[PDB]
Amino acid sequence: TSAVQQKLAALEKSSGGRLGVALIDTADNTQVLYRGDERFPMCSTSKVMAAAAVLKQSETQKQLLNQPVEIKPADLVNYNPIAEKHVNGTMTLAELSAAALQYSDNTAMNKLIAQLGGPGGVTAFARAIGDETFRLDRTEPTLNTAIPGDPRDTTTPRAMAQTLRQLTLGHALGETQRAQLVTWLKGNTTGAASIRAGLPTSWTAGDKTGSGDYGTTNDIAVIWPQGRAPLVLVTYFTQPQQNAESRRDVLASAARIIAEGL
Ligand SMILES: O=C1C=C(Nc2nnn[nH]2)CCC1
């Protein structure tokens, strides 16, 4: 047990919930884990795997990201800030990828899932890139039920950090695709209160947030600190009661503990 793990434990204790953290520091490839091998509901953090799977498909179909997808009124789910504007028209797979990643659009995610042949298509991509832990079982919005003990739509912090590293800094995607994914993550609109709130402001980052039932509050980030090699950081948090409030501040605190421990 490390000092950083003990600080994370104190944060978790005060928070009332269950916290999962995985850091990879690419300076030396060392890792800090807190409940690194426990499962958590991914919620919208799963959008990174779906967008990446479509990017992979685009490696052998140069024009795939320009392919139109019909958006019908019946397609709209519970959170559709971009898709609602395009109902009775179309959006391209690039537009859907951007909407999913940068705005957390749930209708956009469902279109990415459909393009992959269903939730199992996303899981299959995960396996193809060496992630044996990730599982996507349902579409939006039910993938966010976040029931304690339920393995559906979960991963571990350790697995997600490894995967995010391979996707954004490694060779899981072609160079063009990797750059596109990073560009999208760095353009996220939803992340200023989560991991990135706990980081020195001179640092740059991209991230994908998620939230769901049981006060589930998540963020996964790739981070470029000032004067050192990139980090990958996953912070997952979930609470015992179905209607618990979101706690982005807990993710910020976790990130701050990690940052000061470097
Ligand atoms: O509060 C909400 C959050 C949503 N998604 C989300 N939370 N963090 N990132 N994306 C969608 C439903 C309404």
Short mmCIF file of all heavy atoms in Angstrom, two decimals, residues 43-45 47 78-79 103-106 140 144 190 208-212 216-218 246 248, ligand 1:
data_model
loop_
_atom_site.label_atom_id
_atom_site.label_comp_id
_atom_site.label_asym_id
_atom_site.label_seq_id
_atom_site.Cartn_x
_atom_site.Cartn_y
_atom_site.Cartn_z
N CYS A 43 -20.79 3.69 -18.08
CA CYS A 43 -21.67 4.76 -18.56
C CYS A 43 -21.05 5.36 -19.82
O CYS A 43 -20.52 4.62 -20.64
CB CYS A 43 -21.96 5.78 -17.45
SG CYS A 43 -22.67 5.00 -15.97
N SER A 44 -21.10 6.68 -19.99
CA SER A 44 -20.66 7.27 -21.26
C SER A 44 -19.17 7.14 -21.59
O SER A 44 -18.77 7.46 -22.72
CB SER A 44 -21.12 8.73 -21.43
OG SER A 44 -22.49 8.77 -21.80
N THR A 45 -18.36 6.67 -20.64
CA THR A 45 -16.94 6.46 -20.95
C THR A 45 -16.80 5.37 -22.03
O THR A 45 -15.81 5.34 -22.77
CB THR A 45 -16.04 6.19 -19.71
OG1 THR A 45 -16.35 4.92 -19.12
CG2 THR A 45 -16.15 7.32 -18.68
N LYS A 47 -18.28 5.34 -24.73
CA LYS A 47 -18.31 6.02 -26.03
C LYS A 47 -16.95 6.07 -26.70
O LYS A 47 -16.87 6.06 -27.92
CB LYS A 47 -18.93 7.42 -25.93
CG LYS A 47 -20.43 7.43 -25.65
CD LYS A 47 -20.94 8.82 -25.32
CE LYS A 47 -22.44 8.93 -25.32
NZ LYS A 47 -23.05 8.07 -24.27
N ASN A 78 -32.59 9.76 -24.17
CA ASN A 78 -32.72 10.63 -23.01
C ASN A 78 -31.80 11.85 -22.97
O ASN A 78 -31.94 12.72 -22.10
CB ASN A 78 -32.51 9.82 -21.73
CG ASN A 78 -31.12 9.22 -21.66
OD1 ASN A 78 -30.57 8.77 -22.66
ND2 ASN A 78 -30.56 9.20 -20.47
N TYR A 79 -30.84 11.91 -23.89
CA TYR A 79 -29.87 12.99 -23.90
C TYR A 79 -29.26 13.11 -25.29
O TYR A 79 -28.38 12.34 -25.69
CB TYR A 79 -28.79 12.76 -22.83
CG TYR A 79 -27.94 13.99 -22.63
CD1 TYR A 79 -28.46 15.10 -21.97
CD2 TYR A 79 -26.64 14.06 -23.13
CE1 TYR A 79 -27.70 16.24 -21.80
CE2 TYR A 79 -25.87 15.20 -22.96
CZ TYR A 79 -26.41 16.30 -22.30
OH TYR A 79 -25.66 17.43 -22.11
N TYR A 103 -19.99 15.86 -26.72
CA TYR A 103 -21.22 16.30 -26.07
C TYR A 103 -21.91 15.19 -25.28
O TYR A 103 -22.91 15.45 -24.60
CB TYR A 103 -22.18 16.89 -27.11
CG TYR A 103 -21.62 18.16 -27.72
CD1 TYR A 103 -20.80 18.11 -28.85
CD2 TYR A 103 -21.88 19.40 -27.14
CE1 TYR A 103 -20.25 19.29 -29.39
CE2 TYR A 103 -21.35 20.56 -27.67
CZ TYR A 103 -20.55 20.50 -28.79
OH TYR A 103 -20.03 21.67 -29.32
N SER A 104 -21.39 13.97 -25.37
CA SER A 104 -22.00 12.84 -24.67
C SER A 104 -23.42 12.54 -25.20
O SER A 104 -24.28 12.10 -24.44
CB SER A 104 -21.97 13.05 -23.15
OG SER A 104 -21.63 11.83 -22.50
N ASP A 105 -23.63 12.75 -26.50
CA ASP A 105 -24.93 12.50 -27.14
C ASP A 105 -25.25 11.01 -27.20
O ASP A 105 -24.50 10.22 -27.79
CB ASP A 105 -24.98 13.13 -28.53
CG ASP A 105 -26.38 13.14 -29.13
OD1 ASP A 105 -27.00 12.06 -29.26
OD2 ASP A 105 -26.87 14.24 -29.48
N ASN A 106 -26.36 10.62 -26.56
CA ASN A 106 -26.74 9.21 -26.43
C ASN A 106 -27.33 8.61 -27.70
O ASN A 106 -27.14 7.43 -27.98
CB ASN A 106 -27.68 9.00 -25.24
CG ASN A 106 -26.96 9.00 -23.91
OD1 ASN A 106 -25.73 8.92 -23.86
ND2 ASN A 106 -27.73 9.06 -22.82
N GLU A 140 -27.84 2.71 -25.27
CA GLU A 140 -28.36 3.82 -24.48
C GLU A 140 -29.88 3.82 -24.50
O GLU A 140 -30.46 3.60 -25.56
CB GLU A 140 -27.86 5.15 -25.05
CG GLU A 140 -26.36 5.34 -24.93
CD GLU A 140 -25.93 5.71 -23.53
OE1 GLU A 140 -26.79 5.85 -22.64
OE2 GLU A 140 -24.71 5.89 -23.32
N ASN A 144 -26.77 2.45 -18.58
CA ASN A 144 -26.43 3.29 -17.41
C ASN A 144 -27.14 2.91 -16.11
O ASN A 144 -27.09 3.68 -15.15
CB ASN A 144 -26.73 4.76 -17.71
CG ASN A 144 -25.97 5.26 -18.91
OD1 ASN A 144 -24.77 5.51 -18.83
ND2 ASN A 144 -26.67 5.42 -20.03
N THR A 190 -17.45 18.53 -21.86
CA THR A 190 -18.10 18.16 -20.60
C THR A 190 -17.19 17.95 -19.40
O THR A 190 -17.65 17.56 -18.34
CB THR A 190 -18.90 16.83 -20.76
OG1 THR A 190 -17.98 15.74 -20.89
CG2 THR A 190 -19.84 16.88 -21.96
N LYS A 208 -13.11 11.88 -21.52
CA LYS A 208 -14.51 11.50 -21.73
C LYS A 208 -15.16 11.19 -20.38
O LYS A 208 -14.71 10.29 -19.67
CB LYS A 208 -14.59 10.28 -22.66
CG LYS A 208 -16.04 9.85 -22.97
CD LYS A 208 -16.76 10.87 -23.87
CE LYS A 208 -18.29 10.75 -23.81
NZ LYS A 208 -18.84 11.41 -22.57
N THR A 209 -16.20 11.94 -20.05
CA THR A 209 -16.94 11.75 -18.81
C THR A 209 -18.06 10.73 -18.96
O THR A 209 -18.41 10.34 -20.08
CB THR A 209 -17.63 13.06 -18.38
OG1 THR A 209 -18.46 13.50 -19.47
CG2 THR A 209 -16.58 14.15 -18.03
N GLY A 210 -18.62 10.30 -17.84
CA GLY A 210 -19.83 9.49 -17.87
C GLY A 210 -20.54 9.60 -16.53
O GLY A 210 -19.92 9.86 -15.51
N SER A 211 -21.85 9.41 -16.55
CA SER A 211 -22.60 9.33 -15.32
C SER A 211 -23.81 8.45 -15.53
O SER A 211 -24.20 8.18 -16.67
CB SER A 211 -22.99 10.71 -14.80
OG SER A 211 -24.00 11.28 -15.59
N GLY A 212 -24.40 7.98 -14.44
CA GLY A 212 -25.51 7.06 -14.54
C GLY A 212 -26.20 6.92 -13.21
O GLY A 212 -25.98 7.73 -12.29
N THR A 216 -23.38 7.25 -10.20
CA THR A 216 -22.14 6.87 -10.88
C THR A 216 -21.58 8.08 -11.61
O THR A 216 -22.29 8.78 -12.33
CB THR A 216 -22.38 5.66 -11.80
OG1 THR A 216 -22.84 4.57 -10.99
CG2 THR A 216 -21.08 5.26 -12.50
N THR A 217 -20.30 8.33 -11.39
CA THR A 217 -19.64 9.52 -11.94
C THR A 217 -18.23 9.11 -12.34
O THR A 217 -17.43 8.67 -11.49
CB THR A 217 -19.57 10.65 -10.90
OG1 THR A 217 -20.81 10.75 -10.18
CG2 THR A 217 -19.26 11.97 -11.56
N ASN A 218 -17.94 9.21 -13.64
CA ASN A 218 -16.71 8.68 -14.22
C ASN A 218 -16.01 9.68 -15.11
O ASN A 218 -16.63 10.60 -15.65
CB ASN A 218 -17.03 7.46 -15.09
CG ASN A 218 -17.73 6.35 -14.34
OD1 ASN A 218 -17.56 6.19 -13.13
ND2 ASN A 218 -18.50 5.54 -15.08
N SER A 246 -24.60 13.04 -8.55
CA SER A 246 -23.26 13.00 -9.16
C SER A 246 -22.22 13.64 -8.26
O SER A 246 -22.51 14.57 -7.52
CB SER A 246 -23.26 13.71 -10.52
OG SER A 246 -24.12 13.06 -11.43
N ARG A 248 -18.71 14.85 -9.31
CA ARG A 248 -17.53 15.14 -10.14
C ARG A 248 -16.36 15.65 -9.31
O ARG A 248 -15.18 15.44 -9.67
CB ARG A 248 -17.88 16.12 -11.26
CG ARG A 248 -18.91 15.57 -12.24
CD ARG A 248 -19.26 16.53 -13.37
NE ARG A 248 -19.80 17.80 -12.88
CZ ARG A 248 -20.26 18.77 -13.67
NH1 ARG A 248 -20.29 18.59 -15.00
NH2 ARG A 248 -20.71 19.90 -13.14
O1 LIG B 1 -26.99 14.16 -16.29
C1 LIG B 1 -26.92 13.57 -17.36
C2 LIG B 1 -25.61 13.08 -17.84
C3 LIG B 1 -25.51 12.38 -18.99
N1 LIG B 1 -24.36 11.94 -19.51
C4 LIG B 1 -23.09 12.19 -19.06
N2 LIG B 1 -22.76 12.36 -17.78
N3 LIG B 1 -21.38 12.58 -17.80
N4 LIG B 1 -20.94 12.51 -19.14
N5 LIG B 1 -22.06 12.25 -19.93
C5 LIG B 1 -26.73 12.04 -19.82
C6 LIG B 1 -28.05 12.11 -19.06
C7 LIG B 1 -28.17 13.35 -18.19
#
